[PDB]
Amino acid sequence: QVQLVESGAEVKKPGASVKVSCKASGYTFTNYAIHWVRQAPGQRLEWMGWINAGRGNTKYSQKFQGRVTITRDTSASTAYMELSSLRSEDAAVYFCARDESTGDYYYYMDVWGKGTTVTVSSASTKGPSVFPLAPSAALGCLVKDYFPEPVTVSWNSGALTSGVHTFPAVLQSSGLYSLSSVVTVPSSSLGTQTYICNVNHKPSNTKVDKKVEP
Amino acid sequence: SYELTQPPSVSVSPGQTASITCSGDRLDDKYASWYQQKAGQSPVLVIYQDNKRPSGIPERFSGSNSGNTATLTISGTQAMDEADYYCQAWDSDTYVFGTGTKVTVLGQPKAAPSVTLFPPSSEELQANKATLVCLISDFYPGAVTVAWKADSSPVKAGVETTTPSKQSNNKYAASSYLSLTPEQWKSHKSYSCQVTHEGSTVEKTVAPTE
């Protein structure tokens, strides 16, 4: 079917530039325009511009002050968006979407991509400190002060899955992330069942196994 | 530039009819489209050219454009229709999305939050740090507000709180952290995490002397 696939998540410093691609499949790339739309955390969708994949002409939102360049590669079925002089307001999810035609008739988008995230921050890679949240039942792990996203948390090397809720991370004023994982367990199990949370932060190559005791 | 203004929120029970409006200048001369965006998903086109429906979109979505107001009507709303809804139109070579409307469908009965407050671990305190962790679980609807108290005064520094997220039973959980120094933690009689859900406040309290 018609599908749009954006490239992977990016982590950038303020002032840098980022190039996101959108790979199109399931239709004739050359007959449609591709839109770029962004969404900052918790905010409205924001149109950035479009390119007619056939002719190559473009239209840009004037809000971006000529910081946006949209291009396409017809043999690759790929549209590109380059955002230069990144600043923290550019940290957002970036969607590509296909126009109903070439951006000049009914003015609606019929197919959307999955979106990709661009993080913009002056923070440097930092591994987390992992602390136990001892029971007294609910117990858990606090994964504190890391950058960038993400960390993954399993329990007992993945053996324990029911009653586990790993929260989305918070971004603190310091620029560093923090999250926690919790398990609700039966009070009987404490002191006989072993509970170990496994924290992996691939950008810093941090692996920590923490046993959570009463 | 051109602006498309939407009400920020609509709350509805399953079966009721939701109406989302979108106002814009000369909207009557424009084609309006509507996109549905469920939590953590890409937008989906539900209405285009004011009132047309794409294939696969439920027929309970309908649209109208009259008197410079586009209106998205969801008849007999279902729980799965909970989403953000965006209006979209075109003006001066610019595609414009509306401000967006959060549509809440009260699908479950009201459930008050369970609150669990963890003090700083001794391991954290030995690393010269201290974080209180407040877990808020099993509540519905998904909206909650967190307030921290040190003794009885409101805490306005060091607080971060996650946006609620569904558990595996379709109730919501939330998380809140109060970052302190160990000296600040150890020099107060008590700290409390106060969770307000539908006008009713749940509280938990911890102390350095426990």
Residue numbers in the entry:
A (entry chain A): 1 to 52, 52A, 53 to 82, 82A, 82B, 82C, 83 to 100, 100A, ...
B (entry chain B): 1 to 9, 11 to 106, 106A, 107 to 210
Give sentences copied directly from the paper behind this entry.
The HCMV Pentamer, composed of gH, gL, UL128, UL130, and UL131A, enhances entry into epithelial, endothelial, and myeloid cells by interacting with the cell surface receptor neuropilin 2 (NRP2). The other critical tropism-determining complex is the HCMV Pentamer, which is composed of glycoproteins UL128, UL130, and UL131A and the same gH and gL proteins that comprise the bulk of the HCMV Trimer. This elongated heteropentamer mediates tropism for endothelial and epithelial cells by binding to neuropilin 2 (NRP2) and triggering the viral fusion protein, gB, to facilitate entry into host cells. HCMV-directed antibodies isolated from asymptomatic donors predominantly target the Pentamer, suggesting that Pentamer-specific antibodies may restrict viral dissemination, making Pentamer a target for the development of vaccines and immunotherapeutics.
Model building was facilitated by high-resolution crystal structures of unbound Fabs (1-103: 1.9 Å, 1-32: 2.1 Å, 2-18: 2.8 Å, and 2-25: 2.5 Å), which were then used as reference restraints and lightly refined as a part of the complex. The epitopes of Fabs 2-18 and 2-25 overlap substantially with each other, with both Fabs binding to the junction between ULs 128 and 131A. This junction where UL128 meets UL131A does not fit into one of the preexisting antigenic sites, but rather overlaps with both sites 2 and 5 of IR1 (16, 38), thus representing a previously undescribed neutralizing epitope. Intriguingly, we observed a substantial decrease in the neutralization potency of 2-25 Fab, as compared to 2-25 immunoglobulin G (IgG). The similarity in epitopes between these two mAbs implies that the decrease in 2-25 Fab potency can be attributed to the lower affinity of 2-25 compared to 2-18, suggesting that 2-25 requires the avidity effects of bivalency to neutralize effectively. However, 2-18 and 2-25 were not susceptible to the same loss of potency, suggesting that they may neutralize via a mechanism distinct from that of 1-103 and 1-32. As expected based on the results of our NRP2 competition assay, the two most potently neutralizing mAbs that we examined, 2-18 and 2-25, do not appear to compete with NRP2 a1a2b1b2 based on our structural analysis. Because the dimerization interface is formed by two copies of UL128, it is likely that the binding of 2-18 and 2-25 would prevent dimerization from taking place while still allowing NRP2 engagement to occur.
